[PDB]
Design a protein around this ligand. Structure first.
Ligand SMILES: *Cc1c(COP(=O)(O)O)cnc(C)c1O
Ligand SMILES: *Cc1c(COP(=O)(O)O)cnc(C)c1O
Ligand SMILES: O=C(O)CCC(=O)C(=O)O
Ligand SMILES: O=C(O)CCC(=O)C(=O)O
Lengths: 435, 435
């Protein structure tokens, strides 16, 4: 079949509500997607929903002849990495620990899928809490609840469906656990030190209340260090530090969902390294191709936890070998070419450009925020927001909406300053058309 | 790193309880895995836990130069197929419908992971039931329960953790929904027409009881057409036909979990095609590389179900493009070379060989059963079973245990009769050593 017929063929079998183009797999490159139908090039600030670290067809992977052989060798088959090991797998794991590892979290576990990575993090926490309870003469049936935030997005699976609360179409009509949910004390425009502290104290009040009223039953607290789909909602390090302390007071683990924030986007390997808070478990995915968890800190206090006992966690494949080989090579490019620092430099620049926009359009471009390359701004009404996205589309710039009123930028770690300019230029163009 | 160091390197980051070999990705072929450490060749009746349809490095994929280009092109990147379409994706989907499609189930949906495929099937059923309830003046909060069997294995995720009940280490200490579970009236040795019917009626009694006592609240019934991990437990078509009728009487969908049984292993595309029972939804995975669901029959009776409304079901990637391209080529080999029929022919043969074993070792080789290439037998004690597996390992034959006392065969659809003989010969060898 032919590019112009892709939508017709798919449309026979599935709901076909994605983008209006057909990806040219060979001709897309860097920060540009190519439409196989028209040949048109689209500036990509979307990156497969922030899941691509280097953009399409990065030269270091495309030109590497030894890599082509390794990738091919891994792609022809799909071994069950859970029980059948290989050199290809071992190199991925050791380069993961070197480039993304945290010496406090030596336990690695791999799975296909972001939601199922968060889920294995929760499963780790449920087991930990039950056994810790048991070892302290508390009933081991206790320890089955997850403290989480409003506007959190953690996945669309059995357990994450009880955590995710953004658009109601994601969770409506699906069975949930009744788990304690608390307000998200994220930063807003026009709120100074005291007003922020007051707002956090209110979330902390709610957190402690939950801990006290379901005694020994809350296994952990999960959070995105910056809420993504919820609307690029950022939190002061102060908030998580209080949360960390409070999790310890009540013998709960703190888990961070870094599936969106992870792997360099914020300017460090993980966002948490900038908030100066130590998690017990971290869930990762998207940019890392394979998903999974890093665990340690208090997890090791329970000698027979889920990473020490066979068959507590498992999936058939244990992650996709091809993903593992690609991610390995991706991680080597990130390290060899200092892409974390490039994300800080270029994130300072994108942020600055959005400050200029906010100044030039004060009533329209609201709350320019960002950490590293992870930036957004808001519009007054959701109708404005949707119009700005359509306008950018017509000008061949792909961005992502979030929430009621947010436009988000998810550029590749390799975005150039010229490319950022091209995106901002397109926004300047579209703005008078929306007002 | 080097093959002899794979276990050491992995062992720093993860629990390392899999097989004792390092897979040679290039030199393994057909029904044989090669140990990269020793060069030893292992007869493979395990197939990455039944997830490989053609064995390692099948000649039709290895020699195909045009395919190498397509696979490479797909493997260099990991697009989000959920919103970015491609020719590569469209060919996979159309060849899936042609080779594995059922005209009653036109709705296809793809996801990475077996558990999450079953989960999307359940999510479809929960939505369907709530909205059907609503349209008939029943409360839409009702419809949140899943009827399922003892010894069922459906995955290790949020929802499937409430369904899976095999070894307690899979589910212990993880939060569950209280869902109605019923006995599995599978065939055993020495039970004729009447004794079987009596046993089914008892399961049916339990099924109806559950339906009547949680009115309008059971969204669906899930089953494996042949229970795999539970111990290759087979059911008479009569049982599912009564279940089908009973699901309709109470307005519940019948979902089949064909993740293990699927894609040719039983001699047809799906096992259900042999039981002459029509499911409303089918969950597939393993051999298909991409996982997902086929849906139709009563699902279409609810106009605004999960396949007609945007954003009810989703994952970031919508399945792995590389898996999709490989599976496409796999499906073409299955079709072009009549591998379904080859599975019937060679499954009749393996089955026959196990009948001979049962005769020669009547007190030891218990209950030789099988459908297509999906066969097993049992041993008297679990200690015998584990010893036979160790003995086969020493003789370089890989098989899979199941349950308390079962050895299962999961050969590639391409297994030769000589290879079956080699497996049986190894079993004959090991048996006197175990007694
Ligand atoms: C997307 C994401 C996930 C879910 O990932 P999937 O691969 O779609 O299952 C979980 N948490 C966050 C913060 C994410 O952005
Ligand atoms: C293995 C399998 C699944 C679970 O598949 P995963 O890929 O490991 O999540 C579900 N149901 C059955 C019958 C299976 O055999
Ligand atoms: O299901 C969705 O809303 C997409 C979720 C997601 O990954 C995101 O947009 O951040
Ligand atoms: O977790 C397990 O027991 C493996 C599950 C499985 O896929 C099987 O063995 O059939």
């Amino acid at each position: 079949t032919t590019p112009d017929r892709v939508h017709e063929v798919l449309g026979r079998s599935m709901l076909v509500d994605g983008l209006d183009i057909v990806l040219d797999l060979t001709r897309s490159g860097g920060s540009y997607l190519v439409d196989a139908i028209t040949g048109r090039r689209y500036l990509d600030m979307f990156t497969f929903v922030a899941s691509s670290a280097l953009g399409m067809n990065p030269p270091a992977l495309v030109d590497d002849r030894e890599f082509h052989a390794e990738l091919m060798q891994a792609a022809l088959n799909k071994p069950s990495n859970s029980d059948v090991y290989s050199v290809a797998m071992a190199r991925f794991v050791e380069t993961f620990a070197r480039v993304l590892g945290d010496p406090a979290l030596p336990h690695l576990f791999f799975v296909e899928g972001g939601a199922l990575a968060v889920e294995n993090a929760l499963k780790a926490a449920f087991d930990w809490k039950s056994r810790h309870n048991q070892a302290h003469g508390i009933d081991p049936a206790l320890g089955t609840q997850v403290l989480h935030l409003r506007g959190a997005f953690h996945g669309r699976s059995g357990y994450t469906l009880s955590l995710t609360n953004t658009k109601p179409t994601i969770t409506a009509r699906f069975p949930k656990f009744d788990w304690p949910r608390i307000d998200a004390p994220y930063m807003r425009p026009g709120l100074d030190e005291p007003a922020m502290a007051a707002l956090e104290a209110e979330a902390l009040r709610q957190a402690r209340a939950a801990f006290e009223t379901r005694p020994h039953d809350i296994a952990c607290f999960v959070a995105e260090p910056i809420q993504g789909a919820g609307g690029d909602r950022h939190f002061r390090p102060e908030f998580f530090a209080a949360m960390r302390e409070l999790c310890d007071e009540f013998d709960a683990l703190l888990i961070f969902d870094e599936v969106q924030t992870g792997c360099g986007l914020t300017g460090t390997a993980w966002a948490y390294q900038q908030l100066d808070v130590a998690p017990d478990i971290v869930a990762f995915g998207k940019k890392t191709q394979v998903c999974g968890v890093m665990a340690g800190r208090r997890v090791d206090e329970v000698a027979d936890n889920v990473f020490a006992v066979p068959s507590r966690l498992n999936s058939t494949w244990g992650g996709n070998l091809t993903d593992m080989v690609r991610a390995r090579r991706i991680l080597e490019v990130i390290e060899a070419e200092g892409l974390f620092e490039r994300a800080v430099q270029h994130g300072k620049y994108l942020r600055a450009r959005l400050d200029e926009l906010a100044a030039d359009f004060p009533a329209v471009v609201l709350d320019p925020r960002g950490r590293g390359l992870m930036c957004a701004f808001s519009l007054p009404t959701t109708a404005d927001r949707d119009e700005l996205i359509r306008q950018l589309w017509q000008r061949a710039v792909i961005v992502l909406p979030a929430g009621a009123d947010t436009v988000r930028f998810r550029p590749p770690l390799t975005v150039s300053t010229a490319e950022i300019d091209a995106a901002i230029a397109a926004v300047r163009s579209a703005l008078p058309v929306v007002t």
